[PDB]
Amino acid sequence: SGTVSCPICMDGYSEIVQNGRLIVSTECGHVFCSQCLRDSLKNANTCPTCRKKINHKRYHPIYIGSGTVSCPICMDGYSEIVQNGRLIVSTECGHVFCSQCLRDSLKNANTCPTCRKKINHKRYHPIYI
Amino acid sequence: LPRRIIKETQRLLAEPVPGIKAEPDESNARYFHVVIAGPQDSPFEGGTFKLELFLPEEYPMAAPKVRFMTKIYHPNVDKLGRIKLDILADKWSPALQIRTVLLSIQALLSAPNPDDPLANDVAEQWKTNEAQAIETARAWTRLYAMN
Amino acid sequence: LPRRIIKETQRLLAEPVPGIKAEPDESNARYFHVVIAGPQDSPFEGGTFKLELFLPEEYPMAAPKVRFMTKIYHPNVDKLGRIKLDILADKWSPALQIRTVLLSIQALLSAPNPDDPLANDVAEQWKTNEAQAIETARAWTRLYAMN
Amino acid sequence: QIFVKTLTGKTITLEVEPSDTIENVKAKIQDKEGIPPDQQRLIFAGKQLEDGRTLSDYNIQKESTLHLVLRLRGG
Amino acid sequence: QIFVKTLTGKTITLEVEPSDTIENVKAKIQDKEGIPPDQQRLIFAGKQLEDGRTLSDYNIQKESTLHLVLRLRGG
Amino acid sequence: GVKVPRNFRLLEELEEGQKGVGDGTVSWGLEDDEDMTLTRWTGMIIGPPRTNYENRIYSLKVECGPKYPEAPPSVRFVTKINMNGINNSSGMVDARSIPVLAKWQNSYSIKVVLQELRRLMMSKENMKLPQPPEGQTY
Amino acid sequence: GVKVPRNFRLLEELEEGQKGVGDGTVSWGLEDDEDMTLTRWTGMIIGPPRTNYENRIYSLKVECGPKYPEAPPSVRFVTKINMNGINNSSGMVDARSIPVLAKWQNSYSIKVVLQELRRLMMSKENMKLPQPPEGQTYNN
């Protein structure tokens, strides 16, 4: 709901990338800065936010340009999308989209619209930013 | 100080939660004197309870430490103010922030569990004679939490 | 009418990419008259080329439709102004938006490819006698693109 | 309309009828932020709200503010 | 030897043996003039010649003359 | 809602024409390949079975106005034919005579028009008409 | 770097006390269970072997100031004892007399204090001193 942050160390996005960290996300959709999640993983094996049991390599980096978020396809901003009741989504390739556009992008091809990596219905999950 | 700590401190200063009042100590930034208003239809209710919170360095990694400085009748809070809440020990998640914890403790007051309990004598009383216990709780509130 | 269309237009209107002019039709927003200045040091250079762009409602799902309204000599542009560029056909992805496409077209003039270009005849000359072809291109530019 | 303040401290707004069950509301929260309702604990007036009851039951109304914490057993 | 001819003008002369496959032949033409084998369509005796077969198969023999028609492309 | 500019719509028609359609009993396509404006078009109708028209080829010329497809296109036969609506002197079709031309809708396409004419040949008033010897024109 | 507040520190000690430690020759604990301020600790030492102290049990009262653990805590014997540093009249220990109390540091805790006392008992100047009869107490 605004510019992205990592709820553990509480840095903004700029600030996160500035110092050579990643932004990443669980399979449960919760976002963090890669250090913090690695350190958390050091002590347990559950999502800091919802307690989902991840047990490693059930997370990956994601890529977003501004810090604020917007689906490149429809060109909507966060508020707009949500208020419509759509979901924010990322591919496993780390590339982010509104649920709707992507759903439809798959109906024609089975490749990511930013990079091209093969995908299907399974390979994308919501994120909660 | 780690940024987060400041934000949290700063954020607490910026926007007060209701019935929960939290002022950091002058000598130590990581140390806090805290006041919790008793939740509604508790025996404590319309009560005021002092707590003190400190955070170890490892925090967020290590959970904060909280204790009651006001004597209170409750199964989870022992005679020395030590709180037995799970999110302070096992279930600690770095994502939880001070403000959350605080509310969690407030909440705890509403819903005591003697099912397993720290302050065993009380617990026994609460399961056996809830009505009484509740009354005693109100008593103690009067005695200790009205000033 | 999808918000996106305006925005893209708007930045197009608010900001113009160099060497290109893009005016939407008044009757219909989805329809555009675009004028491309020939690439510098291209035989075309000094000429001005009209194109028309339209986007099926399905856009961006469906690539836009683009065509030359000015007769031009090139392997990849046929007699009717139909352009064979792959990003309009197989390679189309929603993220790209017009502004890009346009520049992609601008490049094409600069960089003619014989790659199943429709007009084999253009192709034939260009592979066989590039020098000639280039001259002819300049000719046609003079003939058609100077007004 | 109801304001729930999330774990990070961000306010999100919901659309509801006082009839609505707590369980029902938790679903709406799950939808927005991705926490299973088992894990959600919801707080108002320093009191944890229970699943079976309704918003009306606790007399929460138009534009009341709700505080969300993580499921805790205490103990 | 055999001669191959165009709609255009040019007669090109090749060196082949009756065993030689059609594919094989097309390669030889490809080499001389630069047209790929799938583009080329070749006609003799009122017939279009097919890739798998041999020159013997069509009984082309004696310095015979062949016509080359090239596919126009409209992808 | 969605408005399709002439040229692009014409292209759409053109592409379909080249593809050909169904029976292929009627076909259309462009009169001249160097025309950017796609105005001059040629059509073909095959005479429907068991009518004096059967087993015959009719070529048409079709012009597409600036306000095509909003306005209907002008049409005329090139092969001689006896027919209601079809001017015998000129081989030109009166707009109003023909229902689709009279009731033109921006949705209609040339294809439609031709089927229309083909359809129309089979009608009782027409099917009976005597026809000229093959291969004359106006 | 990091400085701990009194209150939590004392609990740390307290817990350790209840756990007990090492050979259990020193033992400490709150004098009273109802005091939130954790001010007063009872301590107990066992007289080290091979000295007039051996096989004797000494109780101490320790007070922990608001300033602690930065400042050292006040210490008294309850059981009567002959020992350097120990005020014969009052059973109070002079801070300076004892090295750890004299050279006090926040890091030091009640446990260390007691051990120190125990060790000291073993030093030559002390070990040979005759003691009063078992079970006498200073006034108070």
Ligand SMILES: [Zn+2]
């Ligand atoms: Zn972080």
Ligand SMILES: [Zn+2]
């Ligand atoms: Zn999670």
Ligand SMILES: [Zn+2]
């Ligand atoms: Zn979208």
Ligand SMILES: [Zn+2]
């Ligand atoms: Zn991707």
